[PDB]
C-alpha cells in the first residue's frame, strides 16, 4: 500500500542502524568462531524447513543471535541453546502458528531441557531489551521487488537465496547493513537471470548506486561462485525446491562487469 511504502522504507533504514550487531564481536568471543556460527545458522535453516517457517523468521532469528553474541560470550556447547531460544522468539514474533516449545527441545536431540530453552528465551529477551522487530534483508528485498518490470519469480527466489547465504558467513557479512546486502542480492539476482542492473528507481528510492554496493557485491558474488563448495549446504538444498523455482541450480555469472 504505497500510501506508506516510503514512510516504512525510511523507518526501516533508521532502525537497521540501531539494530545492527557489533561488527567486531567474534574476535571477542573466547570459545566460538565464525565457523561454529555458520554451522549454527545452517542448522536453523534446516529447522526452518522442518517446520515450514517463514524465511523472515530465520533472518530475525539470526539477527537476534548476532546481537545477543555482540555482548554475551557463550561456550560452544551453549551456542545451540542461544540459537534455539532465538528461533523460538523469532517464531513467536513472526509466525501465525509457531512450533511449540517441545518441538524446539526435540530438534536439539534433547541436548537441552524445556526449562533450559525457556530460561534462555528469557535471557535473550533481556539482552535484547525486548527489541525484536528488527529490519532484515528479507524486508528490504521484498520492497525492492516492487521495482521489477515485470516481476520475475526467478529473480526473487535468487535474491532470497543469496541474501540467505549471507547469514551463513559472519565474515564478511556482519559489516553490511540489511539494506545493502538486499541491494547486492537483488542486483546480483537480476543480472544473473535477466542481464539487467539495479534500476534507477531503486537509486532514487534507497540512494544506493552500483558504486555504493560494489564492496558487498564483490563479497556476495564470491559467495555465490563458491557456494557449491562451502562447508554449509542447507540453503543450497532448500533452494532446489519448486517453491523457490529451483534457483540454487542457476549458474552464477562468471563476471559482474562493474
Amino acid at each position: 500500500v504505497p500510501d506508506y511504502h516510503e514512510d516504512i522504507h525510511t523507518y526501516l533504514r533508521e532502525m537497521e542502524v540501531k539494530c545492527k550487531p557489533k561488527v567486531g564481536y567474534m574476535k571477542k568471543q573466547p570459545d566460538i568462531t565464525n565457523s561454529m556460527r555458520a554451522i549454527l545458522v545452517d542448522w536453523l535453516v534446516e529447522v526452518g524447513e522442518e517446520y515450514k517457517l517463514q524465511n523472515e523468521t530465520l533472518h530475525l532469528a539470526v539477527n537476534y543471535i548476532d546481537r545477543f553474541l555482540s555482548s554475551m560470550s557463550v561456550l560452544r556447547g551453549k551456542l545451540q541453546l542461544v540459537g534455539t531460544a532465538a528461533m523460538l522468539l523469532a517464531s513467536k514474533f513472526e509466525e501465525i502458528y509457531p512450533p511449540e516449545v517441545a518441538e524446539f527441545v526435540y530438534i536439539t536431540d534433547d541436548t537441552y531441557t524445556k526449562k533450559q530453552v525457556l530460561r534462555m528465551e528469557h535471557l535473550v529477551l533481556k539482552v535484547l531489551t525486548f527489541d525484536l522487530a528488527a529490519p532484515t534483508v528479507n524486508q528490504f528485498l521484498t520492497q525492492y521487488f516492487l521495482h521489477q518490470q515485470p516481476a520475475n519469480c526467478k529473480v526473487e527466489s535468487l535474491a532470497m537465496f543469496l541474501g540467505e547465504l549471507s547469514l551463513i558467513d559472519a565474515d564478511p557479512y556482519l559489516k553490511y547493513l540489511p539494506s545493502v546486502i538486499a541491494g547486492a542480492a537483488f542486483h546480483l539476482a537480476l543480472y544473473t537471470v535477466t542481464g539487467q542492473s539495479w534500476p534507477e528507481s531503486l537509486i532514487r528510492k534507497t540512494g544506493y548506486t552500483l558504486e555504493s554496493l560494489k564492496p558487498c557485491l564483490m563479497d556476495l558474488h564470491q559467495t555465490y561462485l563458491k557456494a557449491p563448495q562451502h562447508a554449509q549446504q542447507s540453503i543450497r538444498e532448500k533452494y532446489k525446491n519448486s517453491k523457490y523455482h529451483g534457483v540454487s541450480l542457476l549458474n552464477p555469472p562468471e563476471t559482474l562487469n562493474l
Binding site: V1, I8, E56, P98, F130
Partner: protein, 294 residues
C-alpha cells in the same frame, strides 16, 4: 521490583494479562500495570506488544513506560488513562457526544493510526473498549496484544482477526492479504458509533456481519470492488441489497462527515482512505480539542 507500586484497583482483562491501576509511591504517577503470569514461555502477544509499543511513541498511542521482567511474572507499566470510549459513550447516554468532541477523537485516532501504519504496524483490534481517553481531552490507541509488524508488501497473516462488529469485509470474505485498511474500517465503525452511539454493524456471526454490512452499503459487485466475487468466502447466492443513501446511515452527520465516513467504509481496501490522507479531510477544518464532561 514492584516495591514502588501500590495496586489500587483492577481495571480489566484484555487480550492477555490483567490490568491494574496503581501509583508509583515515590513519584506520584498513576500507572496501568499489565501483569502476565509466566507451558510455552513468553506469549507471542506479549512479545509483539512490547517490541512494538517500545517503537510506537506518539501522543495518541498509549505509552509503555517500563517492563519489569521476572522469572515467574512479567509486568508492563503503562501510562494510565481514565476511561474507555465505550464506558464514555454509555455515559454520554443522554447528552450524546457533541460533534466537536467526536471530530477531535476521530482526528486524534487517525493521528495515532497514521503513526502505526507509517511504522509498519497493524493494530487489528480497534474497538471502543481499546480506545482510552483522559480528562484533558486526549484519546489513545491501547491493547496492542493483537498487533503485528507487517512487511511491504504484505503477506498472509492471522485470519482470525478483529472483534466481529469492527471487522472488515475483506477479513470476513477470507482475503489472503489484508492490510492497514482493516484498522481504518474499524475506525469508520467507531466514528459512526460516536455519532449514533450504537454499533453500526452488531452481527452475531460472520454471515450475519456480512449481511448487515451489505444491507447498509450495498452488496458489493465487481464494479464497486474488483476481485470480490472470486473471494474464497464470497457466495453467488448472497442477497444483492441496494446501497443506502449515506445520509440515512448516520442522519446527524453533515456533508463532510458523510464523505469522510464513506471513504473510511469503502469496500475496496485499495480505495479505502489511509489515516494519513484523512487528516486533511474538510471534516477536520474546524477541529479543536475540547475536554469531555467527565
Amino acid at each position: 521490583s514492584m516495591e514502588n507500586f501500590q495496586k489500587v484497583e483492577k481495571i480489566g482483562e484484555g487480550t492477555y494479562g490483567v490490568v491494574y491501576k496503581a501509583r508509583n509511591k515515590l513519584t506520584g504517577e498513576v500507572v496501568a500495570l499489565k501483569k502476565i503470569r509466566l507451558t510455552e514461555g513468553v506469549p507471542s502477544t506479549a512479545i509483539r506488544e512490547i517490541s512494538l509499543l517500545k517503537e510506537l511513541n506518539h501522543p495518541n498511542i498509549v505509552k509503555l513506560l517500563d517492563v519489569i521482567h521476572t522469572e515467574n511474572k512479567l509486568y508492563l507499566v503503562f501510562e494510565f488513562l481514565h476511561q474507555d470510549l465505550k464506558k464514555f459513550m454509555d455515559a454520554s447516554a443522554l447528552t450524546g457526544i457533541p460533534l466537536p468532541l467526536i471530530k477531535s477523537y476521530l482526528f486524534q485516532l487517525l493521528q495515532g493510526l497514521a503513526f502505526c501504519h507509517s511504522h509498519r504496524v497493524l493494530h487489528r483490534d480497534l474497538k471502543p473498549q481499546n480506545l482510552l481517553i483522559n480528562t484533558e481531552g486526549a484519546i489513545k490507541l491501547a491493547d496492542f496484544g493483537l498487533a503485528r509488524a507487517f512487511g511491504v508488501p504484505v503477506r498472509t497473516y492471522t485470519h482470525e482477526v478483529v472483534t466481529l462488529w469492527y471487522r472488515a469485509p475483506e477479513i470476513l470474505l477470507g482475503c489472503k492479504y489484508y492490510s492497514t485498511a482493516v484498522d481504518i474500517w474499524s475506525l469508520g465503525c467507531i466514528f459512526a458509533e460516536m455519532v449514533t452511539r450504537r454499533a453500526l454493524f452488531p452481527g452475531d456471526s460472520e454471515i450475519d456481519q456480512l449481511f448487515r454490512i451489505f444491507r447498509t452499503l450495498g452488496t458489493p459487485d465487481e464494479v464497486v470492488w474488483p476481485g470480490v466475487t472470486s473471494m474464497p468466502d464470497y457466495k453467488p447466492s448472497f442477497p444483492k441489497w441496494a446501497r443506502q443513501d449515506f445520509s440515512k446511515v448516520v442522519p446527524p452527520l453533515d456533508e463532510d462527515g458523510r464523505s469522510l465516513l464513506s471513504q473510511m467504509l469503502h469496500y475496496d481496501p485499495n480505495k479505502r482512505i489511509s489515516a494519513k490522507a484523512a487528516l486533511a479531510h474538510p471534516f477536520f477544518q474546524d477541529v479543536t480539542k475540547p475536554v469531555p464532561h467527565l
